Amino acid sequence: AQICDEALQYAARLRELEPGWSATPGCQLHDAEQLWLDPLRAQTDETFLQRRLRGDWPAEVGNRFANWLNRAVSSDSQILGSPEAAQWSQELSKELTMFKEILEDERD
Amino acid sequence: VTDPEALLLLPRLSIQNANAISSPLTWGFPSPGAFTGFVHALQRRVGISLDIELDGVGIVCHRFEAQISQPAGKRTKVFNLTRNPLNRDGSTAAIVEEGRAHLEVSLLLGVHGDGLDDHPAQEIARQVQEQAGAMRLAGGSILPWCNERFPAPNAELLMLGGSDEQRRKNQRRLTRRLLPGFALVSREALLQQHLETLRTTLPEATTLDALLDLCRINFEPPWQVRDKPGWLVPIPAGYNALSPLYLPGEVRNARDRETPLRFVENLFGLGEWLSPHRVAALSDLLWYHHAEPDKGLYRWSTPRFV
Amino acid sequence: ILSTASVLAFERKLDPSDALMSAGAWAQRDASQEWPAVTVREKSVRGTISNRLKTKDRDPAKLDASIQSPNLQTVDVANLPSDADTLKVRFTLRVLGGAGTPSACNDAAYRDKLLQTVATYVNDQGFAELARRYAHNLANARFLWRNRVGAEAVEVRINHIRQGEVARAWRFDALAIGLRDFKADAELDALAELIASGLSGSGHVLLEVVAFARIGDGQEVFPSQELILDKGDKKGQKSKTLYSVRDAAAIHSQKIGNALRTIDTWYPDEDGLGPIAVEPYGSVTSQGKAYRQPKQKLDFYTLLDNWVLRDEAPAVEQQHYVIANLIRGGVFGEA
Amino acid sequence: ILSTASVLAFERKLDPSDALMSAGAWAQRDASQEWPAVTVREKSVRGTISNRLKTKDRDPAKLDASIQSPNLQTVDVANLPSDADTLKVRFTLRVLGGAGTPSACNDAAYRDKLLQTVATYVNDQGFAELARRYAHNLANARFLWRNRVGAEAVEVRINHIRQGEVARAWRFDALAIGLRDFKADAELDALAELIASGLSGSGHVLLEVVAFARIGDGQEVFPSQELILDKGDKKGQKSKTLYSVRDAAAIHSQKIGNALRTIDTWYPDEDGLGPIAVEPYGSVTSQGKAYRQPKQKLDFYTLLDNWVLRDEAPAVEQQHYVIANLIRGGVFGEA
Amino acid sequence: MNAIHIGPFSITPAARGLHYGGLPHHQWTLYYGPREMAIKTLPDSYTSSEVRDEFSDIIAEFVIDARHRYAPDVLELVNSDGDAVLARVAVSRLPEALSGCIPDDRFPYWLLTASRPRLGLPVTLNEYTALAVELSAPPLAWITGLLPGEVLTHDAEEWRPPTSWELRHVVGEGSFTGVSGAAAAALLGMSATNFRKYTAGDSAANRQKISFAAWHYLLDRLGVKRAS
């Protein structure tokens, strides 16, 4: 839970940055996460990207973060054989369900 | 001691030179008693005229900077000082080591009373904000946000929600407002159960040693670090009686001769800094006074937390 | 004392080239030298929400808000020109030999015993059944995976190049040669004898295999699909890209090799489904179920260890399977 | 007492350049100066389980769960174009000389004794057997490591570049001159005297070596493989990375130098393998073992210490091995 | 002030002096052998003990590094399947019979190497005890990484006597073995002054070189080499 808390905290200090840093030019700038990285670009663009975050409601990004969280687990076959991986997947699914629900109502 | 009918969010407040020495044993973030006393001073100054009561404060602490330095060759730190004026003979006065800290905190205030039905929410919110913009929070002046880009008004949210989902959405929006910070809560139950765990580990262990063990980094031999549930800071938990409650005119050189004085000793407890999304309701974060004046014990805590 | 070597790295035999895809008309295949190559192109798709819901997306208003925002992708598609009902696919296959000799090994005693075991296998029953089955997998266009499934007619030409010129041409008919039946044919026996000479080290064998499949005019062909790093936006998400070399869609060489390895009809389960690929633990990824499980002791590793160390020679079809696994190569040994 | 010098670093003779790979066709090799380079491209690979399971992954359900999660990777691949069957490899070899003189030597008297030992070697037999064997490794394309195990025909052209121009040309057949036999040939002997004059110090020798291999049209060519930092995601893992210099596949220079070094036939093991590289303690990476063990008293250090310190001169084959290690060079002596 | 001899390390200050701020200081340098290590300016007021403990961090780091650098190999006694490790033994020198190997059902016990390229041998339990007896690593064998091959050979013709630094690795003070000069003298059977003679290097004076048998018996008693 603490890790996803820090993710929100990271997004929290991403509220302290420029309003339109996500609209800068670049070949690769993680545009899948950019709807949640910069919430203030909806003030910058009236209809180019303001309606995109409202219509899309980006909550799958934490699943990508869950993939990064899948790099936080040990590569042990004993956990996968036993129900330890089942409990890990259950608590991971619950906490990223909470994270996706947090990321869903960012428009209010 | 009561459930708040509304929650008033005082926004990012930049306290300039707050008292970094919170306690005789701890330094850093100031005492929660300073915040509860500030809210009671706000109720004393502008709360009565608005026919409302202001009890309970939730601290978020969006930014902390300590006016400290690390001398070379030492792993500890020292406090940067201020040059006091000279004496009447032109000599330097004796230095009292006082530390300062630049804070940026936002406060959740519990509002209950009939005046919430007598005024608009933004009116009483703006009145308590413009009262708080000329006060002090821990010994430091409050920077009232002049000539920046976008100033932040309050958002008084009524806790008497019509529906559970609307109340939940209001609490989540209010948590989203105070996002880059950490709610500071009281952990008497956690400190007591850790004291019982240490007493099972080793007898005649005081609460001071259990408080110390919850703050130092314990290194265990096979060399790993013994983990902690949270941040687990040592906070000043209140004041205990050190003398009988004397008469208002009895104590010489008191602040006023109408308030009774009693000499006290600092009470030390365990506090925890959490991300504010890890709470059921934001009214759990409110710091309440609790006097119990017959037995000393002038505490501040977070009741109705868990 | 003859323990199995810790490294038993084997170079793969039957090395395939990357199979280029072009398009044209049927009966122009004899003039298919300068056919225009199939080019991977972009097309935009919007889609309704059509996966199975997890009993919380089944609310009417929330599903209504889901269908009101269709998901957007740009998919790479490979289509024939509209004046082309036939797809041509070209690759080359190299038959090397020395199938029992590992490229990397640790124990020289185990290496010599494995070499003697493979040489013993060549001595009684040389590379004939495996080469016939590989000839059948060349004869039918199994390397046209989803790409001869709905084909009206499939034809396969296998040419033998000797000094830059053709030596023996093998024009086939992939409809007659089934994907399940390993029968016998005189041209298939000749191709089996050529792969036999290649696998036994008698000579060098390089085969140019061209498959013409009659799908349809302007229809969809199915090349190898690549991997997407997903570094773009969500509207043009680029959810699917297809593999190409130089403005010319193609199939991966390892996909062709897995197509030629589908000869294994000796797995302990029922063989009414058909042949599966040559692999340890008989694992087909479409079914998701492993025949030749190590519980049944019919996998490659248990049979190879019983054959070499304990000298328990398995059934003749199973040692055919073991030597076919050595032909396909691997990182056998400790991993 | 004439002990060994603590620092005995030697510079390498026979310095090879990086071997650039290009692509082309047979019989156009007389005009292969414009040929497009082999480009290290990328392709996606999907794999199932093919390694030995450690008795806990052998359960059917766990194995099938591992099958349903295939290991997707991207691999750097080097293939010829579909109209190109010939792989060209070009490198320059510089023969220096002065192999007796160390780059660093703590003990003067030891330096004088080692110089006298090399001088009495050359007075007994010059750099003639070693230069013949190095010229044989020049003539066969042993520097074409895996681009010769399935090549139909390999050809090597060596030019003596004196003043930026060809002073003497040699053309060979890398398949006729095998990787096992050190026979005698007139052009091979002339190249042997050229390498002899380079190694003695008679003149400056620079050789431009061009190799052509009949692999096949569109077949996979094998450059040297780099080292993987292993930092990215498991989807785009980049399991294999090949070596290129400027958008152009190449073999590492020390790989070419090791393949030219493969002349050591006088190791105490049998001639079943053939020549190995001249290493201290005769190491072979593929076999995972060391010929010329220090226990059997035929390593480079024991032979050199007997030859120099106590004047116990070994057999002329072991003298050739010692002088070939001195040509190879290394940080000899106690660190 | 002067150099502090802690283990093989010498904390040598600079002769020149400076006055950073309002205090005097000195460039103190930590030498492992003829090689410097971490160098820090210490104020003149600093005590010798302060200097030592100050550099103690670098000192400890080096010791740890060395231990890891020369950690002995480890052979695993495993069952017929080979996945389960019944026993682990820290070897001094690998046996001379193991090869590319993986446990086979045929043999109940197999010895393998800790590395990926598992080279080993199928042995029974009594042969496992015999191999563990003749090839076990002593507990402080990693110091043999820091000593050259000439001072560790069992052949007297190839044997070279240790220097003052090489002996000073493991005799006294804060050594890697942690023993003192009197303890190392009592291990060798003689008094403190004579053992000190061997320990002392410098000029021929008190440079009695230690003999081959005494050096190898001292290595046996300290658990560095030949102590199975």
**Which positions ≥6 away from D31 have C-beta within 8 Å?**
none
Is B203 in a helix, a strand, or coil?
Answer: coil
CA pseudo-torsion sign E208, E211, E217, E218:
positive
Largest CA distance in chain A: 53
For chain B, the structural domain boundaries read 4-181, 182-302
Of C230, C262, C294, at which residue does a domain stop? C262
Q: Which chain D residues are within 8 Å of A78, Cβ to Cβ?
A: 56
A71 CA: distance to closest CA in chain D (Å)? 9
Q: Is A24 part of the contact surface with chain D (CB cutoff 8 Å)?
A: no
Count of CB atoms situated within 10 Å of the CB of B306: 10
**Sequence letter at residue C15:** D
Q: How many domains does chain A have?
A: 1
| Chain D interface, Cβ < 8 Å to A | 54, 56-57, 59, 62, 233-234
Asked if the Cβ–Cβ distance from B275 to A15 is below 8 Å, we say no
Cβ neighbours, 10 Å, residue D271: 10
Maximum CA extent, chain B: 71
- Triad D26, C166, C162: Cα angle to 5°: 55
CB of C250 within 8 A of CB of C223? yes
Percent helix, strand, coil in chain A, to 5, is 65, 0, 35
State the amino acid at position C305 in one-letter form: D
From D289, D280, D283, D294, select the one nearest D322 (Cα to Cα): D280
- In angstroms, what CA-CA distances link D73 with B230, C232, C255, E173? 40, 20, 14, 56
CA-CA distance, C292 to D306, in Å (whole number)? 59
Are residues D261 and D277 in contact, defined by beta-carbon separation less than 8 angstroms?
yes
Could you give the dihedral angle defined by the CA atoms of residues C266, C269, C272 and C278, in that order, rounded to the nearest 10 degrees? Answer: -40
Let me know if E159 is exposed, middle or buried by CB neighbors in 10 A (0-12, 13-18, 19+): middle
Which amino acid makes up residue E95? P
Contact C283 D43 (CB under 8 A): no
Residue E102's alpha-carbon distances to A78, C114, C115, E83, in angstroms, are 21, 15, 18, 10
Torsion of CA C56, C60, C64, C70, to 10 degrees: 40
Sheet holding C7-10, edge to edge: C104-105, C7-10, C330-333
The whole-angstrom separation of Cα E114 and Cα E109 is 16
- CA D198 – CA D192 distance, rounded (Å): 10
Instruction: Give the structural domain span for A14.
Output: 1-108
Nearest to B169 among A5, A102, A108 (CB): A108
Nearest Cβ partner of E83 from D56, D288, D335?
A: D56
Question: Parallel, antiparallel, or unpaired for β C15-16 and C154-161?
Answer: unpaired
Q: Taking each helix axis as running N to C, give the angle between helix C129-139 and helix C316-328, from 0 to 180 degrees, rounded to the nearest 10.
A: 60
Q: Do A5 and B179 touch (CB under 8 A)?
A: no
Asked if residue D229 and residue D329 are part of one domain, the reply reads no
Torsions phi, psi for B176 (to 5 deg) = -70, -30
**CB burial string B226-250: b at 16+ within 10 A, e below:** eeeebebbbbbbbbebeeeeeeeee
Q: Which of C64, C234, C238 to mutate to test the interface with A (most CBs of A within 10 A)?
A: C234
Q: Using alpha carbons, list the distances in angstroms from residue D19 to C292, D93, D209, D210, D269.
A: 45, 10, 9, 9, 32
What three-state secondary structure class fits B48?
coil
Angle between helices D316-328 and D300-308 (to 10 degrees): 110
Contact E20, E43 (CB under 8 A): yes
Q: Report the neighbours of A using a cutoff of 3 or more CB pairs below 8 angstroms.
A: B, C, D
Resolution in angstrom units: 3.6
- Chain D CB contacts of A67 below 8 Å: 233
| A28 interface with C at CB cutoff 8 Å | yes
Q: For B275, name the nearest residue in chain A, comparing CA atoms only.
A: A5
Cα C161 from Cα C42, distance rounded (Å):
37
Measured CA to CA, the distance from residue E112 to residue E99 in angstroms comes to 9
Chain B contacts of A12, Cβ < 8 Å?
179-181
DSSP letter string, E79-123: -SSSSSEEEEEEBSS--SS-EE----TTSS-EEEESSSS-EEEE-
Helix (H) or strand (E) run with residue C69 in it: none
Chosen domain end from C209, C231, C262:
C262
Phi and psi angles of residue C41, each rounded to the nearest 5 degrees, phi first: -125, 165
Q: Which position has the token pair 């598992």?
A: E118
Kindly report the nearest CA distance between residue A2 and chain C, in angstroms: 26
Q: Residue D199 and residue D118: Cα distance in Å, rounded?
A: 12
User: Under an 8 A CB cutoff, do A31 and C233 touch?
Assistant: yes
Residues 6+ apart with CB under 8 A from C206: C92, C93, C94, C95, C160, C161, D152, D216
Buried b (16+ CB within 10 A) or exposed e, E5-14: ebbbbbbbbe
Considering only CB atoms, C69 lies closest to which of A31, A32, A55, namely A55
Query: C78 and C146: one domain?
Result: yes
Report CB contact under 8 Å: E82, D55.
yes
Contact assessment for residue D117 and residue D308, using Cβ atoms and an 8 Å cutoff: yes
d(CA B218, CA B214): 9
Tokens of E209: 């070189």
**Alpha helices by DSSP H, chain D:** 60-67, 108-124, 129-139, 186-200, 253-260, 300-308, 316-328
d(CA B267, CA B269): 7
CA distance C1 to chain E (A): 7
AA letter at A2: Q
For C213, the token pair is 């499949």
Please check whether residues D106 and D199 belong to one and the same domain.
Answer: no
CB D75 within 8 A of CB D40: no
The alpha helices in D106-251, defined as continuous H runs, are 108-124, 129-139, 186-200
**C297 touching D, CB under 8 A?**
no
Token pair listed for D218:
């569109």
Does residue C253 contact residue C19 with C-beta atoms inside 8 Å?
yes
Strand residue runs (E) in chain A = none
PDB experimental method = cryo-EM
Q: What is the count of residue pairs from A and C with beta carbons less than 8 Å apart?
A: 18
Take residue D90 and report the two structure tokens written for it: 């070009």
Residues of D in contact with E83 (CB under 8 A): 54-56
- Chain D closest CA to A44's CA: distance in Å? 33
Chain D window 285-314: which residues touch E at a Cβ cutoff of 8 Å?
A: 288-289, 295
C-to-D residue pairs, Cβ atoms closer than 8 angstroms: 124
For residue A42, give how far its alpha carbon lies from the nearest alpha carbon of chain D (Å): 31
Here the tokens at position E190 are: 């003689």
Distances (CA, A) of E132 to A21, C205, E116, E127, E142: 65, 53, 21, 8, 18
Question: Closest partner residue to A77 among D57, D233, D234, by Cβ?
Answer: D57
Q: Are B235 and B287 in contact (CB under 8 A)?
A: no
Spell out the residues 6+ positions from residue D212 whose beta carbon is closer than 8 angstroms to its own.
D24, D26, D29, D32, D86, D87, D88, D154, D155, D156
The HSE-up count of residue A37 (CA atoms within 13 Å, CB side) is 12
Number of structural domains (chain D) is 2
* Lookup: tokens for E45: 């007021």
Residue at a domain's end among C235, C262, C289: C262
Q: Interhelix angle for C316-328 vs C108-124, to 10°?
A: 120
Q: Which residue has the tokens 């016998």?
A: C184
Residues of chain B neighbouring A15 (CB-CB closer than 8 A)? 179-180
Q: Report the distance separating Cα D192 and Cα D129, nearest Å.
A: 8
Same domain, C4 and C16: no
User: Does D17 share its domain with D88?
Assistant: yes
Q: How far apart are CA E37 and CA B302, in angstroms?
A: 54
Q: What separation in angstroms does the CA of C202 have from each of C167, C205, C260, C327, E212?
A: 16, 9, 21, 16, 63
**Helical ranges in chain C per DSSP H:** 60-67, 108-124, 129-139, 186-199, 253-260, 300-308, 316-328
Chain C meets chain B (3+ C-beta pairs below 8 A): no
Q: With b meaning 16 or more CB within 10 Å and e meaning fewer, what string describes A76-92?
A: eeeebeeeebeebeeeb
H/E segment holding residue E165: helix E164-168
Coil, strand or helix: which one is C217?
A: coil
Domain that holds residue C63: 12-98+127-262
Query: What's the rounded Cα separation, in Å, for the pair B46 and B52?
Result: 9
D323, burial (CB in 10 Å: exposed 0-12, middle 13-18, buried 19+): buried
CA distance C124 to C117: 11
Distance of alpha carbon C228 from alpha carbon B128, whole angstroms: 55
Residue B207 to residue B268: CA distance in whole angstroms: 9
How long, in residues, is chain C?
A: 335
HSE value, Cβ hemisphere, 13 Å, CA-based, for B52: 32
- The pair of three-digit structure tokens given for residue D87, joined into one six-digit string: 């792989």
CB E129 within 8 A of CB C19: no
| B114 in Cβ contact with B48 (< 8 Å) | no
Q: Are D326 and D130 spatial neighbours (Cβ–Cβ below 8 Å)?
A: no
Question: From the CA of E96, how many Å to the nearest CA of chain C?
Answer: 13
Q: Is E149 in CB contact (< 8 Å) with chain D?
A: yes
All partners of chain B with 3 or more CB pairs under 8 angstroms = A
**Nearest chain C CA: its distance from A33 CA (Å):** 9
Burial (CB < 10 A; 0-12, 13-18, 19+), residue B109, is buried
Regarding whether C165 and C110 lie in a shared domain, the answer is no
Beta-carbon separation of D60 and C293 below 8 A: yes
Same-domain status, D221 and D131: yes
Task: Measure CA of the first residue to CA of the last residue in chain B; give whole Å.
Answer: 15
Q: Could you tell me what percentage of chain C is helix, strand and coil, using 3-state DSSP and rounding each to the nearest 5?
A: 25, 25, 50
Q: Where are the beta strands (DSSP E) in chain E?
A: 4-6, 9-13, 25-32, 35-43, 74-78, 85-90, 99-100, 110-113, 119-122
- Diameter over CA atoms, chain C: 73
Tokens of D92: 């320059």
